[PDB]
């Protein structure tokens, strides 16, 4: 009640918890998601082999 919640009042004058600008803190899972992997092109060879 003191600091508020998603359902109970915040007990403060016009105060709401700050919103998250990103859904999940882990981006590796987002990268590994099937939808992203289907769209992304095949990768390379990390460090490019020196030519000439």
């Amino acid at each position: 009640q003191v600091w508020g919640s998603e359902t109970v009042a915040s007990s403060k004058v016009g105060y709401t918890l700050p919103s998250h600008i990103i859904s999940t803190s882990d981006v590796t899972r987002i990268i590994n998601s099937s939808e992203i992997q289907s769209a992304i092109r095949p990768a390379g060879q990390a460090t490019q082999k020196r030519t000439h």
Binding site: I21, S23, I36, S38
Partner: protein
Amino acid sequence: GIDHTSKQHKRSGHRTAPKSDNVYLKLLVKLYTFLARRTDAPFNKVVLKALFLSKINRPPVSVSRIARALKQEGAANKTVVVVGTVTDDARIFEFPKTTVAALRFTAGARAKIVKAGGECITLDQLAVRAPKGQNTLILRGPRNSREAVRHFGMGPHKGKAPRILSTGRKFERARGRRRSKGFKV
């Protein structure tokens, strides 16, 4: 010796990597950099470039702007993508249902969207839903709407809002603005 025809070691002039220390925004920037690197869709590159703009470069956008954007035919199914903060606009009375993705949502704008039935998502959810930005529309606010802009490039015979703290009678309205008092601009 080389006869240089242009400045050497010249900076590109485009801001690379965000100046802000926001860790969440840094993760979003990294995600969109990977998306633009691995995909040929220009939408990812545009979003990445827009993520690097400053506070004055990312003007705010009212809900009426997305309402007007949806009013155009063929944009009803399009999911709006605005890089900035969506703000509530009391001028618009009816808000059509849609999907809005932005970095930050105002409380009033979010409440209006929820009441109207639209959905609000964040940038990573938008990216995972549409990695190539399919059926997405880009909205930008007025860049020159800032009060500082009207003072930009002040000069004679220009009328560019001269800088003055207090306006009214006797404040920058004497000789120089009236033909009777000497001359006009």
